[PDB]
Amino acid sequence: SLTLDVWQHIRQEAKELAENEPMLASFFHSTILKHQNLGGALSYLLANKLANPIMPAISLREIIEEAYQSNPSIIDCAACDIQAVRHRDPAVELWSTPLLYLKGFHAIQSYRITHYLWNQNRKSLALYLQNQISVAFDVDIHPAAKIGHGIMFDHATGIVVGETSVIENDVSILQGVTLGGTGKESGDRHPKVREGVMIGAGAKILGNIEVGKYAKIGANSVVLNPVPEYATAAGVPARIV
Amino acid sequence: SLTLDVWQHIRQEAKELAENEPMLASFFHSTILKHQNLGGALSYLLANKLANPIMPAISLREIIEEAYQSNPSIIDCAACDIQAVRHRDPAVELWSTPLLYLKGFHAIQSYRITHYLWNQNRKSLALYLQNQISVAFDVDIHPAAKIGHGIMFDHATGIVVGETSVIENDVSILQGVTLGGTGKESGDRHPKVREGVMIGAGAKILGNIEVGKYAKIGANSVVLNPVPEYATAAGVPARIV
Amino acid sequence: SLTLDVWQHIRQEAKELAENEPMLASFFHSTILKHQNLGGALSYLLANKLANPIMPAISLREIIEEAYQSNPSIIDCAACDIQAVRHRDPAVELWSTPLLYLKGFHAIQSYRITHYLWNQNRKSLALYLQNQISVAFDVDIHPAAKIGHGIMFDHATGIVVGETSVIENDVSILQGVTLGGTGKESGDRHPKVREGVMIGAGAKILGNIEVGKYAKIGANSVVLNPVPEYATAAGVPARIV
Amino acid sequence: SLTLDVWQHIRQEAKELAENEPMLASFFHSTILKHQNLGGALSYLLANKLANPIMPAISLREIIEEAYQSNPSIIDCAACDIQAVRHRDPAVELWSTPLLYLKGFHAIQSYRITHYLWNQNRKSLALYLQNQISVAFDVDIHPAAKIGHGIMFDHATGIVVGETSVIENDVSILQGVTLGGTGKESGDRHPKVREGVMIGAGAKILGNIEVGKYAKIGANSVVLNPVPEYATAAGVPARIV
Amino acid sequence: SLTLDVWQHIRQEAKELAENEPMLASFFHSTILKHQNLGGALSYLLANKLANPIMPAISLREIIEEAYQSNPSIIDCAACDIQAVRHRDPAVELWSTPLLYLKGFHAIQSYRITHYLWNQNRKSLALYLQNQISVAFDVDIHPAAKIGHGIMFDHATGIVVGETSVIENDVSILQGVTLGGTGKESGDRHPKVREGVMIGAGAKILGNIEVGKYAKIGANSVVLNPVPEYATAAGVPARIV
Amino acid sequence: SLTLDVWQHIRQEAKELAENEPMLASFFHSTILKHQNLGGALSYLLANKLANPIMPAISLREIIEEAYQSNPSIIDCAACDIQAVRHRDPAVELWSTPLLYLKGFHAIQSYRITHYLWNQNRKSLALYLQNQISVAFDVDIHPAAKIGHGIMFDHATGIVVGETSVIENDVSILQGVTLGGTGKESGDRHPKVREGVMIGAGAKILGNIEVGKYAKIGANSVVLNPVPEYATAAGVPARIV
């Protein structure tokens, strides 16, 4: 219902947009209209955006499709993610825009493929794609990280998320945000960003520490200690305001 | 004209570079020497760097040239921006380096096309190109933003300029800088950066606030409050100094 | 010999990895298994990654090899860098991983080619490649910067290293880090980062200043003053801790 | 099914071939081994070889696969055609070989798509692909031609088959063969080649004439008159021998 | 103007074709509808079809367009060439078809560019393009040949025209036809095909000899002797009938 | 060495031609002038002309060079072949022209690689390339055919050499020529064409037959019987003359 609604909004938009812009009309038909569900479209776009002669789009599309088949909820996150960005970003009005044009959104959804592959012990492929993702969209997310749905990577450029990190539902992350890693450890070194959290541009959250639900982290904050539920944190190093 | 003065410096440099670097001689000839004016070299270059099978270089060129044909001051800005970069960056000695090699310069000039397109109601196309610029140059500038001339985007990775921003003439912006947006609004949300301002690397300027003419923002500052003319602001959050 | 050791380690892993991932098997063979030494594999990958019609991989590879043949220590640095990454980054377990997949490692080894061309007064070429590195890896390093070996550029996106900079051996630099630049100085404006230094994410180090051996710079710090050996700097601006 | 026997044979060769040639191992896996039937492999290959930026492989595959869903005996024909080539060409040993490497086989199978499109009244797409087929394979078949199964287009270079041609089952056609077009007439202008005919290299067969079942046409022969069942025609112009 | 009427017919078809086929709609708009005249459309296509990284579409277009500038009769020939193919080929109905899809037409128009280039003493570039034409369309026409207009190369595969050939207006040539060259001469070795001639598939016209106006050459014919006006020639070697 | 003489000539032509055509300057430098011997230039050229994502030019180049290194006579044949074409084609005047622009020349040299691959039991790779040659150059020659040196494939469209053929030294072959195969039989089916033979355009020679030294086959001839030394054969079927 969420997934079908979003898909139908996107199709409805794609018809209007193709009428208005004949330079992109075939793009709208081949990327959205001639497909039958969101997963058909997402796999097409991601495959194109991540293609390389080592593994071209046509062949990569099949890996993505097998992932969607064997874990259908990956596509459902994408639908939440589309709605989340549209809602929270005043610049985004169309349902189709995140799907078509936002590289943070593409990064997130592409990470869901590497996470799947990592859990099937196709680690070498996950790593190959981690890099593609990083090069295509400027976003470095380790395949082993655990990310919920309703996530917004707003202007994703510069985001880094480490192997042990956890991002729960409804979290929002701006450009230049780093999650995790103190100069020290191994075996569980990265933040746990609980649900509803807002993280401002440039913010560095480092270490196995909790950022509690509905916390705001200030722009360019360096967060080294746990942040309580509903708190605001700001400064370098960060203080609870 | 500055355009014609920069153009003639660029041609004179190309001839000598072509002689000294035969690997790149055809590049200098097809990019610069066989074009009558700056517009031709700029339309050729941007079209190449922003090309995609959805809209190849040869086709994009025609859009860029239609923009130059109907708003020629767009090219006059490019020349201002070239001079700005060469003048303000000690590492850039040649007039041609910005045109050929500086991705920050390239993003700005590409934004100018998207701005044009946005004002012609070709908004799908403008969004499509916004994404391309973000992928090609690591710079996110919304087409509706208002940017003047003589602007330098130096090593421009991670720069973000929001829908509602204003950047006046002779402004300098380094890597990691974002303009705008408290998570507080729709309608006019982003900064107005006035003439001659220098914004240091990694600074975040958030809100519908004034950064007054000739101010200096220190590196990694978070500017949440209006900065008076000629002031230096610094720290997270920023204080006057 | 570290070079030979690392290379044997990487060939060992490649045969095993080819066995597990048939989708990637030929990639491991043409990249690693059918080359006699590290420099054959390196020149292959970097050429592919920096390829452009202006200078396709097949040409570029020759240039990289001329540099390797006439300056073998470039390759020995690569092996140090590989070991540096593996040992220092917890997420990195295989010796092949840095070689194949990490854009930070690729950008450093690429800079070494641009440094060589700069020193042979082939500066057009060095500048053309600087821009390609910046596009492919989102790492901006001036060809004239002097960088040692045992270097890690961990998740390298947004790293900017200035023309005058020096980075001594065994330095670690994370995403978002800038080296150097203030105002109208020329001729030696950029930091000297000394052996063993560790620069946290988002740090901006500005000016012709010293960062003393084995110092730690905290994340998002702005370093305007020289940093003592074995010291920790944090804050905006940075204070000794 | 001939189709399933042929497919089994192709899968069985592909495993052997992948072990023998690690330069090509990934190619055998992405082309054959990771697909579930002959249609998957055929649509993948054809899409790749007819790809253009106007219609990339990944889109083209969708269109080809739709044809296969609507008319599965298009695949059964390919299987028949593979068997034909392997059997009649002594140089062809492997079942995989026609599927992978024979531009005549590819031309025919591609024609089957355009024929389908032509009857679905998508004549623009059909003409577009007729050109792409002509350029990729050097075979010019009009989409309206009627071609049965068991067909071999051996070496196929300069084969031309007119709009009104009929080629029945089990016909063999060598390089440089032209079907049809006398003088000027309109409406039904091209040969009807009957079951089991062998047409030698260079033969030109003009006008709405019957070439009867099991006839042989000699090399470089011009056939202007009907050829009776089991007859051998030869010379310019052709006489029964 | 024939040229103007042809162009207007083409646009008119493009409008209706784009409405019928969404997959090709953008192609129609960017190839035809968004261009002012036949010359702009033709330069777009040829550039694209002969593109190579040595000279990309975008660069080559400027050269094609320079030729069109300093000798606009080249574009008029193209317009007759289009009318000829449509009028003489029963299979070709639309004015747009030859422009978009017929490689015989594309080869002819492409040779006109090389002819221009040859006569401007740009012989190295004319030669480069002669090879590109031959690779792209399988038609080998030497730059120094003299071809008039109203020419139809129907299904052009295998056509070979030598350095001294002369083809006058309204000539028709099918697949596999060769013009000229015998037992070693130099200086004027090649046929002079006068106007209104029709040359059947596979015919080979060797030596410096007149093929008289309005003659018909038979398929697979070898014409070693001069052919009188209005005459039919057939056989190998050829004889008047 | 013939090799060296040819090489010096070519190098000197490229210097002049580079100076005279700046659009191609870097092409002359990257293809010819920066390589030390003919092998270097050849492997570069052929790698580019046979490249494909399945095996890109950079990897193809290594295979080609391995062959040249382990069997240096292959390069010597190339030089003979350059000389043969230059001498025998009156249109071909420069020594660089064959190396750079003639598909017949390229097909022959590409065949030498497949033949080498075949004789190293790399049957799959040789077959992969057979097809690439056939697509790149419109020439089908089987890797197991035995071809000598001083060969000319003059305008090569449509040439077909069977698996069992033998072409001894100094044979010339025009467009549309076919060697061999009659019908049922295996093991030694194709013609043995001896030293010096000239085969005219369109000639089909079929069966395990001797074409004796310095024979002349006429255009469009079908040769079913043996041809005596110095004899001339012409017609369909061919009679000695």
DSSP line for B17-58: HHHH-TTSHHHHIIIIIT-SSHHHHHHHHHHHHT-BTTB-HH
User: What are the angstrom distances between the C-alpha of D8 and each of A9, D79, D96, D105, E25?
Assistant: 44, 11, 10, 19, 41
Residues B236 and A236: beta-carbon distance below 8 Å: yes
Closest by Cβ to D158, choosing from E23, E91, E158: E158
Q: Any chain D CB within 8 A of the CB of A125?
A: no
Q: Residue F174: its chain E contacts at CB < 8 A?
A: 178
Nearest CA of chain E to the CA of B23: how many Å? 12
Q: Any chain B CB within 8 A of the CB of F222?
A: no
Residues C177 and B202: beta-carbon distance below 8 Å: no
Strand F210-211: give its sheet, edge to edge.
F146-147, F166-167, F192-193, F210-211
Q: How far is CA A88 from the centre of its chain?
A: 14
Between CA D221 and CA D239 the distance in angstroms is 9
With residue B75 as reference, give the H or E element that holds it: helix B73-88
Q: Which is it for the CA torsion A65, A66, A67, A71, positive or negative?
A: positive
Between CA F238 and CA B179 the distance in angstroms is 83
∠ CA B119-B125-B130 to the nearest 5 degrees? Answer: 90
Q: Which is it for the CA torsion F107, F112, F115, F117, positive or negative?
A: negative
Which segments of chain E does DSSP mark as H helices, in order?
A: 2-20, 22-28, 38-50, 57-69, 73-88, 96-101, 103-119, 123-137
Residues A199 and A217: beta-carbon distance below 8 Å: yes
Q: Which residues contact B219 (CB under 8 A, 6 or more apart)?
A: B174, B200, B201, B202, B203, C178, C204, C206, C222, C236
Between CA D195 and CA D169 the distance in angstroms is 5
Query: Do the Cβ atoms of F58 and C61 come within 8 Å?
Result: yes
Q: Residue F160: its chain D contacts at CB < 8 A?
A: 155, 157, 175, 201
Q: Which residues contact A175 (CB under 8 A, 6 or more apart)?
A: A154, A155, A156, A157, A158, A159, A201, A202, B140, B158, B160, B178
Q: Residue E237: its chain F contacts at CB < 8 A?
A: 218, 234-235
Between CA F147 and CA F125 the distance in angstroms is 19
User: What are the angstrom distances between the C-alpha of A217 and each of A235, A238, C110, C238, F28?
Assistant: 9, 9, 36, 21, 58
Residue among F39, F38, F56 at smallest CA distance from F47: F56
Structure tokens at D34: 């990771």
Nearest CA of chain A to the CA of C220: how many Å? 7
Query: Do the Cβ atoms of D218 and F236 come within 8 Å?
Result: yes
Between CA B121 and CA B143 the distance in angstroms is 11
Residues B197 and B181: beta-carbon distance below 8 Å: no
Which chain A residue shows the shortest CA-CA distance from F55?
A53
Question: Longest Cα pair distance anywhere in chain B, in angstroms?
Answer: 57
Structure tokens at D116: 């389908």
The residues spanned by each domain of chain D are 1-139, 140-241
F140-241 belongs to which CATH class? mainly beta
Between CA D235 and CA D222 the distance in angstroms is 7
Which chain C residue shows the shortest CA-CA distance from E56?
C53
Angle, helices F73-88/F57-70, rounded to nearest 10 degrees: 100
Q: How many other CB atoms sit within 10 Å of the CB of residue E22? A: 16
Q: Which chains touch E (3 or more CB pairs under 8 A)?
A: A, B, C, D, F
Between CA F234 and CA F230 the distance in angstroms is 13
Angle, helices B57-70/E57-69, rounded to nearest 10 degrees: 60
Structure tokens at B178: 């974002």
With residue A205 as reference, give the H or E element that holds it: strand A204-205
Between CA E62 and CA D161 the distance in angstroms is 37
Which amino acid type is present at position D145?
Answer: A
Residue D128's beta-bridge partner residues? Answer: none
Structure tokens at A181: 């890693």
Q: Which residue has the tokens 């492919």?
A: C136
Between CA F226 and CA F214 the distance in angstroms is 13
Dihedral (Cα; C109, C114, C115, C120), 10-degree rounding? 140
∠ CA D171-D175-D181 to the nearest 5 degrees? Answer: 75
Structure tokens at B110: 């590409």
Q: Residue F34: its chain B contacts at CB < 8 A?
A: 23
ω into B72 cis (within 30 of 0): no
Q: Residue A37: its chain D contacts at CB < 8 A?
A: none
Q: Which residue has the tokens 């790749």?
A: D48
Query: Do the Cβ atoms of A202 and B178 come within 8 Å?
Result: yes
Which amino acid type is present at position F104?
Answer: G
Residues C202 and B204: beta-carbon distance below 8 Å: no
Elucidated via: X-ray
Residue of D26, D27, D35 to mutate for C, most C C-beta atoms under 10 A = D26
With residue A192 as reference, give the H or E element that holds it: strand A192-193
F1-139 belongs to which CATH class? mainly alpha
∠ CA C134-C136-C142 to the nearest 5 degrees? Answer: 25
Q: Which residue has the tokens 């305001």?
A: A241
Query: Do the Cβ atoms of A61 and D56 come within 8 Å?
Result: no
Q: How far apart are the first and last CA of chain B?
A: 39
Between CA B221 and CA B205 the distance in angstroms is 8
3-state secondary structure of A17: helix
Residue among E29, E22, E24, E23 at smallest CA distance from E44: E29
Residue of A17, A24, A99, A103 to mutate for B, most B C-beta atoms under 10 A = A24
Structure tokens at A187: 């075996």
Between CA E57 and CA E76 the distance in angstroms is 22
Q: Residue A91: its chain B contacts at CB < 8 A?
A: 142, 162-163
Q: Residue F24: its chain B contacts at CB < 8 A?
A: 26
Q: Which is it for the CA torsion E33, E38, E40, E43, positive or negative?
A: positive
Structure tokens at F29: 């430098």
Residues A212 and A240: beta-carbon distance below 8 Å: no
DSSP codes of every residue in chain F: -HHHHHHHHHHHHHHHHHHH-GGGHHHHIIIIIT-SSHHHHHHHHHHHHT-BTTB-HHHHHHHHHHHHHH-THHHHHHHHHHHHHHHH-SS--SSHHHHHH-HHHHHHHHHHHHHHHHHTT-HHHHHHHHHHHHHHHS-EE-TT-EE-SS-EE-S-TT-EE-TT-EE-TT-EE-TT-EE---SS--SS-S-EE-TT-EEPTT-EE-SS-EE-TT-EEPTT-EE-S-B-TT-EEETTTTEE-
Q: How many CB pairs under 8 A join C and F?
A: 23
ω into B53 cis (within 30 of 0): no
3-state secondary structure of E83: helix
Q: How many CA atoms lie within 13 Å of D154's alpha carbon, on the beta-carbon side?
A: 29
Residues C110 and C46: beta-carbon distance below 8 Å: yes
Chain breaks in chain F (C to N over 2.5 A) after: none
Residues B24 and C126: beta-carbon distance below 8 Å: no
Which chain C residue shows the shortest CA-CA distance from E52?
C53
